[model samples]
Target: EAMAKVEEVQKVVKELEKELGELDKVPSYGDAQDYSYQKALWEEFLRIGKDNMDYASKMKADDKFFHKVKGDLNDFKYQIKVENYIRQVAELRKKYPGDNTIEEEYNAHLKQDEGKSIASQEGATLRDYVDREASEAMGRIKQRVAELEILEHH
Candidate 1:
């Protein structure tokens, strides 16, 4: 640390003491503000919910009730991972517009699915389908994004 005179330190101590007293005063919420930025994000989330509600009815009509809520454990569990994967996808979309190779997983999945389902005829046990995994360790997901830039040099 740099050396300072005793007087210099005392001056900052007194100034801080004066400002600390101001914190005792008061605070205000935008209980009344123009344009009402109050709770802006809550309102935005509601708007998206409202927009999706109508489309849900169409899913209901098709008896995709199972599909809809299948998309709903799609409701939980892997939901967070899927949401997370999407957030990373959007982050990449910012730098590389109009590109959709971000779906290489689906492309590869389809290509290899034949090998997987050929054994679909085999009913092993509960461990069969239950043996699954998720995109664990969010730190890996973030690093997954960071490495994309160097990839573009290819």
Candidate 2:
């Protein structure tokens, strides 16, 4: 009986592995709205942020100029993901309001302004905070969407 059960388990394991491997070939989808709308926006925002950073670096002085833009560039590259982050923050606020970071409030402004930030985080640059904040909002939105995607797939 023990030997038979072992064979059965092995068969099931093999079948499941085959299925998982096949899943890669299949055009499986997560939330299409999330992918098409949220993901796309975040990627675009990231791109624009990078491009602007390049401009700021070229136009301004290295030691004193475009300092904030540098930070914004780093933030966008490492953290920002527009649609994802905002939706996540909304859900997060509902669950734990105490954890509400000013980032979420800034996210609201981003939705309204539909613009990007060019500000320096270190306050060394002359760029506007409004732009930096907006760019940060885009990043947050993208971050939230990414979490959702992970949750959804798993």
Candidate 3:
């Protein structure tokens, strides 16, 4: 069961890496500093726990190994959850500046669980809900932001 979770984490890490790569391809509109900072955020978040699965897979099935790895794995898992929440919060706030509705709903959800993951929410997981909302906001941003630049010199 633990090994299976390791495999699952590995898959998720790969998917996140791919998504970060896609982000790199987006036009920065000369906002290179912001783009670079965002890239670094993704990179640090990716690097923190990327090798845990491999390390876990190699460890012997002994009490010492199991105890240590299990604790480390739990920390890794929680770190990822916190990272996701922080990034989602940032994205939501950025995409909906001064929007009380978004702020209230997000705060209410967090308050209910005392800043814990809302993955237990019925019908839809917090990750799914946040991703959908963020995606919609991103679409709106794309519509507003200029994609290409043209220069005319006489």
Candidate 4:
């Protein structure tokens, strides 16, 4: 009876392995909305993978077979987080050209606005308009960097 139960567990573990392997492929998606949709899909995949590994660990603590599964799940989770951070950093770089660190980019953004704006009846001067716009984007980028830093620290 014990041998039969072990075989049953092994069968289930193999099936889980196949399903998890299939999740590694990123599906081709569509439209602008699909980007966000795909991100959510990756998030869900990580959640489910973690849950499965947790259950596996409970069923057989430190078994050689489950170790590979756990490691693969962890690698997948790290890949997703790395991909998200890459996207964030790239976007920030695009906004603040020639600036590397978040702080440098933010200071460059601030420098664009300092003592450069003047008011007018027609509207703010062109420099003022540009400065205001840059400042707004810099504010958003700073907030995003703060959030990203917190995530990185954790």
Candidate 5:
């Protein structure tokens, strides 16, 4: 189930990065043209990425302890379970290499890093992207893991 969260987070970041590049083609869906908002999207990428990993890693600790106490399979470190999840998400990505949804990140990244601009179809803000996905991921976590508790109440 940790992979479940990691998988969603990984996929969301994939969309987040992809949508960020969409800004080049059209104005943000929110119509706020400030670098600070743009900059925060990049930061959100890191926050979600980090929190997802940490969240899963912690779950893995519980996972290991649960199994070990049940059957004593002889485990100690949490890092290996953590490492397993990091790889788990990568394998999910690898299973479909040419998939455009997955590839959108690099496609979008080029538009930014190399200025290959030719882009926005939906005209979304990275803010909107986070708004929808934060709600989704947290909603799932809330029922499954108790709560995400990221309420700005916004």
Candidate 6:
């Protein structure tokens, strides 16, 4: 709608043409300008995977292996969501500072970790355990976040 003017429309058309022309440009990986910022998010996912493995080990019931996998599924799913969002934020930050809020980033990462606190000691099924743990984790993360001396707030 804003590009109705000839000059404005022409400028938009030129930019699109320029971008299309660069589609064949080669990408350079392992370069200094590469996205090393996303390392934090990847590291957190690995940490969560380790913690989940420890939790599964304690379950120990052969029957619970599938159940344990199911239990960890929700967290794994949440982790994917967090990674996607974090990557988006990192890209934004690379182009422009303050484009993404630190609190939003923190909350995204915190969601999976926080939800783990919701589990109950008396769960009979994997679903029961995950539901309870998620709720509890959220509570703890929120409390701890408030008590911590984090520098950035969104």
- Provide the overall lDDT of each model, using Cα atoms, as 2-decimal numbers: 0.33, 0.44, 0.45, 0.47, 0.33, 0.40
Kindly provide the TM-score of model 2 when superposed on the true structure, using C-alpha atoms.
0.28
**Per-residue C-alpha lDDT of model 5 across residues 1-154, encoded as one tens digit per residue:** 6566445544444453454344334322232232233334434434544444444434433354433232111110121222222232233334444545433432333112212211121123323433353334333433432221232223
Q: Indicate whether candidate 1 or candidate 6 has the larger TM-score.
A: 6
| Candidate 3 per-residue C-alpha lDDT over 78-120 given as tens digits, one digit per residue, 9 for 90 to 100 | 4344344445545655655665655554454422232343323
Clashes in candidate 3: how many? 0
Count of clashing pairs, candidate 1: 3
Looking at candidate 5, the ten consecutive residues that score lowest on lDDT are 70-79
Off by over 4 Å in 4: 1-34, 62-64, 90-154
Cα lDDT tens digits, model 1, 1-154, are 2233323333433443343234223232223332133224224433443333334433332343524432322222222222333334434445555544433432222111334321232222212332332233233434544676667766
Each model's RMSD to truth, in Å? 22.6, 18.9, 9.3, 19.7, 19.8, 18.8
- How would you order the candidates by TM-score, starting with the best? 3, 6, 4, 2, 1, 5
Q: How close is candidate 3 to the true structure, as a TM-score?
A: 0.38
Superposition TM-score, candidate 6 onto the true structure:
0.32
How close to the true structure is residue 94 of candidate 2, measured as C-alpha lDDT? 45
Q: Residue 113 lDDT in model 6?
A: 39
lDDT of 2: 0.44
TM-score, cand. 4 = 0.30
Residue 21 deviation, candidate 1, in Å?
34
Badly placed stretches (over 4 Å) of model 3 are: 1-48, 101-154
Q: Which of the two candidates, 2 or 6, achieves a greater TM-score against the reference?
A: 6
Count the clashes in each prediction: 3, 19, 0, 0, 1, 15
Better of 1 and 6 by lDDT: 6
Clashes of 2: 19
